[PDB]
Structures are given as structure tokens and as C-alpha cells.
Write a protein that binds this ligand. Structure first.
Ligand SMILES: CCCCCCCC/C=C/CCCCCCCC(=O)OC[C@H](COP(=O)(O)OCCN)OC(=O)CCCCCCC/C=C/CCCCCCCC
Ligand SMILES: CCCCCCCC/C=C/CCCCCCCC(=O)OC[C@H](COP(=O)(O)OCCN)OC(=O)CCCCCCC/C=C/CCCCCCCC
Ligand SMILES: CCCCCCCC/C=C/CCCCCCCC(=O)OC[C@H](COP(=O)(O)OCCN)OC(=O)CCCCCCC/C=C/CCCCCCCC
Ligand SMILES: CC(C)CCC[C@@H](C)[C@H]1CC[C@H]2[C@@H]3CC=C4C[C@@H](OC(=O)CCC(=O)O)CC[C@]4(C)[C@H]3CC[C@]12C
Ligand SMILES: *[C@@H]1O[C@H](CO)[C@@H](O[C@@H]2O[C@H](CO)[C@@H](O)[C@H](O)[C@H]2NC(C)=O)[C@H](O)[C@H]1NC(C)=O
Ligand SMILES: *[C@@H]1O[C@H](CO)[C@@H](O[C@@H]2O[C@H](CO)[C@@H](O)[C@H](O)[C@H]2NC(C)=O)[C@H](O)[C@H]1NC(C)=O
Ligand SMILES: CC(C)CCC[C@@H](C)[C@H]1CC[C@H]2[C@@H]3CC=C4C[C@@H](O)CC[C@]4(C)[C@H]3CC[C@]12C
Ligand SMILES: COc1ccc(C2C(=O)c3ccccc3C2=O)cc1
Ligand SMILES: *[C@@H]1O[C@H](CO)[C@@H](O)[C@H](O)[C@H]1NC(C)=O
Lengths: 673, 21
């Protein structure tokens, strides 16, 4: 029975439906599940005021405001501010009840419903760990995790130290394994394997142990990219088996501990660190509290064998043949199988919803592809044409928005164009036609246009199951240029800058060179373009290799005429900035020499910034910890006070503007600064 | 305060991961 020792079951248990149902309801110890429930509830309590935005609710959902919002379903709308505060209070109470184990099912539902409502209210805040939090709450709703270390069993003896069915652990282990394995198969991308995603991360001070035996390029290629991919692909197998459990635990602990310090991902690392003692035996808390000194063994609840439970089926050779599995056992087994299959399938469902497929497949947040793609934006231009007068105007990029994610997706762009169309008539503009011109580079590629600039977005066609037509394709057969681009960027001056641009045939780019941007030139690398100076009205054709100097404070255009896309580059210098720097340095040196034998004010304030940075570096970490604690306390106190004010308004009524202003002023006192 | 001109709208010459909060 070697297989029966490695896997915990035998191949014959899967030969019939009844045997499978009997296996999946095997009694188990509930200690690990209770510890995980407690930790998850505590982390959600800590996370609600910080990342979910309880402290910025008044800014986000202010009454009487013109905002473009991006919900998944346009039929979903936010409530007034007071009802939003009530929703967040109910979510907080549910998380607290989940953590304490008191009224487990009601608290689970009270956390699950408003959390998912708030998640679906906004597409621009979706990430992978918020999706995981929703999934974990949904799973824990159907589990009986209040059978140990809880208030429910303290006040009710029928649910104290009882058994649990086996599929409770199976579902959670399967979820964790799915996350790990599908994160590593997503990182078998050519950008990740070749080292193009996280190229500057090895400059951190945490990687300095590895530089004692490797170069910086080798450290970036091996430790950051290949090491991360291998950990993701092997962590589940290392954790599942008992031979390699200890090494896997150490490796994943180090991985998550480093990730918690390199990035700002909320509570993701702590959630993952506390989901890894769930691959251990279900009795580990009991052994751990047994190994403690006997002095501290008389205050905890007395250790005893768990009592039988109804939810799990009992099969014994001597203790009766067994009972017929009722509806509960079959429903549990079916839920396990179907949920695991759906969670396997969903990350690879992008061929059905083609309307959400831009350069990158799908929306962001449910495919476990973290840090694989990085985006840089060069320019955004929005122009509207009046339908009554024909005049052309220009808007700021992102006037009525609160995020910047609308620049990367076509559904969000359609929503934004519609919201602008309905809002502009309030500003004495008849029915407009809106055109967008956005330049993006992904993973240090050439900059290019993501959408067609000649298409009126408000009247364009977009559907959830049809591939969008006004989305420009990514120029994939230009990536091998990145070596040359990096070499050209590296072999430059400390005062010059470069911009790399790839354009499609039949389109032109119009640029206005600023007054201070003297000594600007354009050089062609591939294809053929013609440059037109607007004032002098002189076309000029360029060939591969030559460069042309442009005037400052004037317009010019670049027309692409080759049958294939053509790439060129911009080189420019800030003559005003260099003159300012040189005169500042000269005057500072002269003054220093004279003494020892607003320009200066800017030099002195930059020096003061340097002094503050270096003195905070010299300051011990205790001051930083104190400041961090003070900021956290201020955030928590403000959230509580605003919630109290809103609840008082809802329950009693709005007293007066003067008292409301006084209370709002009180809530922003910065307790100890 | 929601309108550019044409000398600040045409100046082309003047890093992002979605996991970060
Ligand atoms: C063979 C079916 C899958 C079982 C896992 C085989 C191990 C080989 C590699 C898998 C790595 C981790 C897989 C995910 C873990 C979740 C399942 C699990 O924990 O099973 C173990 C558990 C015994 O645990 P303990 O007695 O603690 O033994 C611990 C070992 N010292 O055994 C079971 O629960 C048996 C479960 C049977 C399978 C149900 C779970 C997986 C369901 C598959 C999802 C897909 C749905 C339908 C599949 C369609 C095609 C088949
Ligand atoms: C009526 C009660 C009144 C109580 C008042 C008490 C007075 C003292 C006031 C305390 C104020 C501090 C409250 C906030 C808590 C501490 C601060 C905090 O968590 O900060 C977040 C901080 C980092 O945040 P950043 O994102 O850097 O924040 C900056 C945003 N850019 O996160 C943390 O430190 C997380 C802390 C949680 C750790 C707890 C353990 C987590 C899990 C690890 C366990 C490992 C597994 C164990 C095995 C068991 C597995 C089954
Ligand atoms: C359902 C909640 C799921 C929670 C999300 C977490 C991850 C789930 C993965 C799914 C991600 C994306 C798939 C969503 C498909 C449904 C979207 C939808 O129908 O609405 C889109 C669209 C609104 O478009 P916007 O760009 O807001 O408007 C443009 C002008 N302002 O709505 C409409 O066009 C009206 C409805 C269209 C048809 C409705 C669907 C009919 C067929 C149903 C099957 C498809 C969905 C099944 C859901 C599977 C479970 C996830
Ligand atoms: C003398 C006058 C000025 C009274 C002002 C006192 C305030 C500074 C108190 C009143 C309400 C207190 C808050 C009430 C409730 C909480 C919940 C509490 O929630 C937890 O997260 C603790 C449990 C856990 O760790 O999960 C954290 C402290 C905090 C924000 C307290 C911080 C300090 C506050 C704002
Ligand atoms: C305009 O900028 C270019 C680019 O920096 C300058 O060309 C450099 O000239 C120095 C000589 O002083 C050479 O060592 C560099 O190799 C040149 N760089 C390139 C990219 O060719 C040019 O001198 C500047 N002109 C003015 C008038 O400032
Ligand atoms: C400069 O060259 C362009 C061709 O590259 C001439 O024709 C323009 O071409 C663009 C793109 O093909 C069209 O969008 C324009 O409508 C064309 N006409 C004009 C007047 O721009 C362009 O005419 C040339 N400039 C001059 C002064 O002859
Ligand atoms: C009051 C209402 C609007 C709050 C939201 C409740 C409904 C819409 C929520 C509660 C539980 C949620 C489900 C929880 C888990 C999953 C599995 C995931 O793989 C796809 C989404 C899906 C299927 C969710 C869809 C939205 C859902 C059904
Ligand atoms: C910079 O290099 C990395 C950045 C992020 C990660 C992800 C990841 O791949 C993962 C999988 C499961 C749980 C957490 C995580 C991360 O933090 C990995 C490497
Ligand atoms: C650098 O150039 C920009 C325009 O390209 C200009 O606005 C800015 O003032 C210049 N820098 C300094 C220090 O003047």
C-alpha cells in the first residue's frame, strides 16, 4: 500500500460513485481549519479600512458629482454615501463574526454579499488577491470551520470538538494548488523567460547576498525570473508530499517574505503564508500546543478525542456496515468536483469572450498572471468635434475619471466615451464626436497606437463576444530590436533623451516642439517617412540612416508612406534645463570659493531634501516604526468616526450644517503628529 | 478647467503593474 501511503487513499475508492462519496466524507480533525478561519478573519478585519477604501469613501462616492464609473454591468449603480457606509459596516461585522466563530453562517453571508457587490461595482480596482479573497469567503461559507477554537462551540456543546468531512480540506488544497500551478504556466511567456518583465528589480538591497557569486545580469536572469518560475511550478508538489514538506515550507516562506517587502500587495503574502500549514496534518495545532511547557497547559481547553459529527459518514468493519450517504454527502462531493473543474477552466476561457481581448487576453484579475506585463504611456490626446458648429476642441486626458485603466481596454473606452457624450451638453457643447489618440509601450517595446484615431468611439461597435475592430494589432515582429534599442539608450549623454516610435502606414503623427526643447532631431531606423514643416510648408523624405534637425516652438508632421510599418527615433535636449544647471553650479562654486577665501533657493531645497533623506537613513528604525503606527492609527480612527457620523445621520437625521462641519473637522485632527 | 489649447495637447515630448494598490 505504498500508493495508499503517498496519496492517503487507494485506487479502488475511485471505481464507483458510492465509494467516492464515502471517501470524500471521511471524518477529519477540525483544528487546522479553525486556525485558518481565525487568521483569515483577522486579516480581512485589518484589510477592510486600508485597501477596500473605508477611509476614502467620502471622497470616492461624494454626493452631487460628475464622475464616469466603470462597472461590469451598467445596470449596477452605487447607493448614496450613507448607505455605502452601512454596507461597509455590515461587511466589517461579518468579517468580525467570521474571525470570532460566532454565528458562522450568518456572518459568512453578511461578509460575502456586500464584498461581491463592491467588487462588481468597479472594474478598475480588480486584482488577483481581491479575487482570491472573494473565492476564499465563498468556499468558507459552505464549510463547517466553527467546530474548534470558537465562541459557537463554547456556547453550544453539539458543535464542540466534532469531526469534519474530508472534502473541506480537499477544496482548499485544490484551490491553493491551482493558483500556484496556473501562475507558473502563465510565466512560461517569452517575455518572462528572456528576462524582460522585471529587469530593474535586482538593484534592490535585498538581493545583495546573491551578488556575492553572480553578476547583476545573471542575478536578474536566474534568481528573479527562472527562480520564481520554478518555485511557482513546483510549490504544490513540494507541499503535498510529506517527504519534502519541510523544504517546501521554508522555500515558500522565504518567497512570500521577500515579496511582502519588495512590493505593495496589501495582505496577499500573509494570506499565502497562513494557507501553507493546511497541507500539513489536520492535527498540527494539537501537537504544537502539546509540545509547549506543561506550565501553560492548564489554561487552554482540555485536550480530548473529537466527538462524532453528523456531516461526515462513518464506515467501520466492526462498527456497523455503514449508512447510506444522504443528500448532504452527495452534494458535498459534487460541489468539490464541479468547483475544482470550473476553477481549472476559467483562466483559459478567453476564446469565448473575445470582446475583452486587447493586446493582452481578458480583463485583469482572474487569470493569475502577476507582474508579467508592464506598460508605459507616452501621450494621450482626446479631441471632440461639435455636431452643430463643427468646431474642434481638446479635453484633458481623464477629466471625470478617478483611475487610469481606461487607456488599456476597449470596453472601458466605450464606457468613457458614452459618459462624456452624456456629460458634455452640460458644458454648452452639442452632441459631440470623440476621437482618442493613445501611445503605449509594453515591456520596453516600440511606442505605438493602441486604438484607431480616425474612428468615432461613441458610435463605434463593441460586443462582449466579438473581436473589436478599432483595436490596433501589436507589432510582434519588432521585438528583436530591443537589444539595439537598449544599446542606443545606454550609449548616450547625461543631458539627452530618446523616444522610440513605430507607426502604421496611412497615418501621420503631428507634434509641437516646446520652446525650451532646443537641439531636437529625428532619425529613421526602418521604412521611409516624409517630414513636413507646417510653417514653411516643405515636405522632405528620409531614408534608413539619415537624420534631420527640427526647429523649436513650431509644429511638424511625420507621414508614414512605406507599405510596412516604419520605426524612427527622437533625440532632444533641454537647453533651458542645462543652462540653469550650469549657471547654478557656477554660482555655487563661486560663492563657496568666495566664502572659503531663486536658483540658489532651489539648490538649497534640493540639498534639504537630501539632508532629510540621509538623516532618516541615519535615524534608527524605531522612529520609522512609530511614524508607521501613528499613520495606521489615524487611518483607523478616521474610518471609525466617519462611519459613526453616517450611522447617526441614517438613524436620527441630518441635524444641521454647522454641527456636521464641526464633526467632519473633528474627524481629521491627526491625533499625534 | 477641462480644456487644453493645441500647444499643450500636441506636445508628445514631455512602469505600471496592475497588482499594486
Ligand atoms: C488523483 C486525484 C487528485 C488527488 C491528488 C493526487 C496527488 C498527485 C498530485 C496532486 C498535487 C495536489 C493535488 C491537490 C490536492 C487536493 C486533493 C487532496 O488533498 O487529496 C488528498 C486527500 C487525502 O489527504 P490526507 O489523507 O491528508 O493525505 C495527505 C497525504 N499525506 O485525498 C482526497 O481527498 C482524495 C480526493 C479525490 C480527488 C478529488 C480532488 C481533486 C478533484 C479533481 C479536480 C477536477 C474535477 C474532475 C476531474 C476530471 C478529470 C479526472
Ligand atoms: C477596542 C479595541 C481597541 C484597540 C486599540 C489598540 C491600540 C493600538 C493601536 C494599533 C494601531 C495599528 C492598527 C493596524 C495594525 C498594524 C498596521 C498594519 O497592519 O499595517 C499594514 C502592514 C503592512 O502594510 P503596507 O501595505 O506597508 O501599509 C502601507 C500602505 N502603503 O501589514 C502587516 O504588517 C500585516 C500584519 C498582520 C500580521 C499577522 C499575521 C499574518 C499571518 C502570518 C502567520 C503565519 C502563519 C501561522 C501558521 C498558521 C496557519 C494556519
Ligand atoms: C457574473 C459575475 C462574474 C464576476 C466576475 C469575476 C470573474 C468572472 C469572469 C468573467 C469576466 C468577463 C465576462 C463577463 C460577461 C458578461 C458581461 C456582460 O454581459 O455585460 C457587458 C455589456 C456592458 O458593456 P460595457 O462595456 O459596460 O457597456 C458599453 C457601453 N457603456 O452588457 C451588455 O451588453 C448587456 C448584456 C449582454 C449579454 C448578457 C450575457 C448573455 C449570455 C450569458 C452568458 C455570459 C456570462 C455568463 C457568466 C459566467 C460566470 C462568470
Ligand atoms: C479622549 C477623546 C479624544 C477620545 C478619542 C479616542 C479615539 C482616539 C478612539 C475612539 C474610538 C477608537 C477606535 C475604536 C475601535 C477601533 C477598532 C480596533 O479594531 C481592531 O482592529 C482591533 C481588533 C483586531 O486587531 O482585529 C482598532 C482600534 C480602533 C480603530 C480605535 C482607535 C482609537 C479610537 C478612534
Ligand atoms: C545636440 O545634441 C547632440 C546629441 O547629444 C549633440 O551631438 C553630440 O556631440 C558631441 C560633441 O560635443 C559628441 O561627442 C556626441 O557623440 C554627439 N551625440 C550624438 C548623439 O551625435 C550636439 O553636439 C548638440 N548640438 C548642440 C548645438 O548643442
Ligand atoms: C507631404 O506628403 C504627403 C504624403 O505623405 C502629401 O499628401 C498627404 O498625405 C496624407 C497621408 O497619405 C493625407 O492624409 C493627406 O490628405 C495628403 N494631402 C495633404 C495636403 O496633406 C502632402 O500633400 C505633402 N505635403 C505637401 C505640402 O505637398
Ligand atoms: C447582493 C448581490 C449583488 C451581491 C453579489 C451576490 C452575487 C451576485 C455574488 C455572490 C457570490 C458570487 C460568486 C462567488 C464565486 C464565483 C466563482 C468565480 O469563479 C466566478 C464568479 C462567482 C460565480 C461569483 C459571482 C457573483 C456571486 C454569485
Ligand atoms: C518579481 O517576481 C515575482 C513577482 C510576483 C510573483 C507572484 C506569483 O507568481 C505568485 C503565485 C502564488 C502566490 C503569490 C505569488 C506572487 O507574489 C512571483 C514572482
Ligand atoms: C524641460 O523641457 C520641458 C519641455 O520639454 C520644459 O517644460 C521644462 O521647463 C524644461 N526643464 C526646465 C528645468 O526648464
Amino acid at each position: 500500500s505504498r500508493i495508499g501511503k503517498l496519496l492517503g487513499f487507494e485506487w479502488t475508492d475511485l471505481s464507483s460513485w458510492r465509494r467516492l462519496v464515502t471517501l470524500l466524507n471521511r471524518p477529519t480533525d477540525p483544528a487546522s481549519l479553525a486556525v485558518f478561519r481565525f487568521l483569515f478573519g483577522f486579516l480581512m478585519v485589518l484589510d477592510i479600512p486600508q485597501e477596500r477604501g473605508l477611509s476614502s469613501l467620502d471622497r470616492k462616492y461624494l454626493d452631487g458629482l460628475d464622475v464616469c464609473r466603470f462597472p461590469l454591468l451598467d445596470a449596477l449603480r452605487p447607493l448614496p454615501l450613507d448607505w455605502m457606509y452601512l454596507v461597509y459596516t455590515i461587511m466589517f461585522l461579518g468579517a468580525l463574526g467570521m474571525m470570532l466563530g460566532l454565528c458562522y453562517r450568518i456572518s459568512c453571508v453578511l461578509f460575502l454579499l456586500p464584498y461581491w457587490y463592491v467588487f462588481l461595482l468597479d472594474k478598475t480596482s480588480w486584482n488577483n488577491h481581491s479575487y482570491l479573497y472573494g473565492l476564499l469567503a465563498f468556499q468558507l461559507t459552505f464549510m463547517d470551520a466553527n467546530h474548534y477554537w470558537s465562541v459557537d462551540g463554547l456556547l453550544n456543546a453539539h458543535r464542540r470538538n466534532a469531526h469534519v468531512p474530508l472534502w473541506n480540506y480537499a477544496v482548499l488544497r485544490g484551490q491553493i494548488f491551482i493558483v500556484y500551478f496556473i501562475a507558473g504556466v502563465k510565466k512560461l511567456d517569452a517575455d518572462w523567460v528572456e528576462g524582460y518583465s522585471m529587469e530593474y528589480l535586482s538593484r534592490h538591497w535585498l538581493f545583495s547576498p546573491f551578488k556575492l557569486l553572480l553578476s547583476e545580469e545573471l542575478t536578474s536572469l536566474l534568481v528573479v525570473h527562472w527562480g520564481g518560475l520554478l518555485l511557482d511550478l513546483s510549490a504544490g508538489f513540494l507541499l503535498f508530499f510529506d517527504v519534502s514538506r519541510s523544504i517546501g515550507l521554508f522555500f515558500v516562506s522565504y518567497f512570500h517574505c521577500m515579496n511582502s517587502q519588495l512590493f505593495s500587495i496589501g495582505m496577499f503574502s500573509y494570506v499565502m503564508l497562513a494557507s501553507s500549514p493546511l497541507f500539513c496534518s489536520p492535527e498540527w495545532p494539537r501537537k504544537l500546543v502539546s509540545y509547549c511547557p506543561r506550565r501553560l497547559q492548564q489554561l487552554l481547553p482540555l485536550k480530548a478525542a473529537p466527538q462524532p459529527s453528523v456531516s461526515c459518514v462513518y464506515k467501520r468493519s466492526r462498527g456497523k456496515s455503514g449508512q447510506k450517504p444522504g443528500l448532504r454527502h452527495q452534494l458535498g462531493a459534487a460541489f468539490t468536483l464541479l468547483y475544482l473543474l470550473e476553477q481549472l477552466f476559467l483562466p483559459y476561457s478567453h476564446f469565448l469572450t473575445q470582446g475583452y481581448n486587447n493586446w493582452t487576453n481578458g480583463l485583469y484579475g482572474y487569470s493569475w498572471d502577476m507582474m508579467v506585463h508592464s506598460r508605459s504611456h507616452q501621450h494621450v490626446k482626446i479631441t471632440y468635434r461639435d455636431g452643430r458648429t463643427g468646431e474642434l476642441g481638446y479635453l484633458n486626458p481623464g477629466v471625470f475619471t478617478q483611475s487610469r485603466r481606461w487607456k488599456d481596454h476597449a470596453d472601458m473606452l466605450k464606457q468613457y466615451a458614452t459618459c462624456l457624450s452624456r456629460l458634455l451638453p452640460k458644458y454648452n457643447v452639442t452632441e459631440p464626436q470623440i476621437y482618442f489618440d493613445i501611445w503605449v509601450s509594453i515591456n520596453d517595446r516600440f511606442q505605438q497606437r493602441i486604438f484607431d484615431p480616425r474612428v468615432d468611439i461613441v458610435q463605434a461597435a463593441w460586443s462582449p463576444f466579438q473581436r473589436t475592430s478599432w483595436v490596433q494589432p501589436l507589432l510582434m515582429d519588432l521585438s528583436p530590436w530591443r537589444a539595439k534599442l537598449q544599446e542606443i539608450k545606454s550609449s548616450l549623454d547625461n543631458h539627452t533623451e530618446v523616444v522610440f516610435i513605430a507607426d502604421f502606414p496611412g497615418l501621420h503623427l503631428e507634434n509641437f516642439v516646446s520652446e525650451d526643447l532646443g537641439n531636437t532631431s529625428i532619425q529613421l531606423l526602418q521604412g521611409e517617412v516624409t517630414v513636413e514643416l507646417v510653417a514653411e510648408q516643405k515636405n522632405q523624405t528620409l531614408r534608413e540612416g539619415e537624420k534631420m534637425q527640427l526647429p523649436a516652438g513650431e509644429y511638424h508632421k511625420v507621414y508614414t508612406t512605406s507599405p510596412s510599418p516604419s520605426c524612427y527615433m527622437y533625440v532632444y535636449v533641454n537647453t533651458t534645463e542645462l543652462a540653469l544647471e550650469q549657471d547654478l553650479a557656477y554660482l555655487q562654486e563661486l560663492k563657496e570659493k568666495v566664502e572659503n577665501g531663486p536658483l540658489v533657493q532651489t539648490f538649497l531645497r534640493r540639498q534639504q531634501r537630501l539632508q532629510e533623506i540621509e538623516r532618516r537613513r541615519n535615524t534608527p528604525f524605531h522612529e520609522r516604526f512609530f511614524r508607521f503606527l501613528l499613520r495606521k492609527l489615524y487611518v483607523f480612527r478616521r474610518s471609525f468616526l466617519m462611519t459613526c457620523i453616517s450611522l447617526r445621520n441614517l438613524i436620527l437625521g441630518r441635524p444641521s450644517l454647522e454641527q456636521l462641519a464641526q464633526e467632519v473637522t473633528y474627524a481629521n485632527l491627526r491625533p499625534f503628529e | 478647467a477641462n480644456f487644453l489649447s493645441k500647444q499643450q495637447a500636441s506636445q508628445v515630448l514631455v512602469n505600471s503593474l496592475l497588482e499594486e494598490t
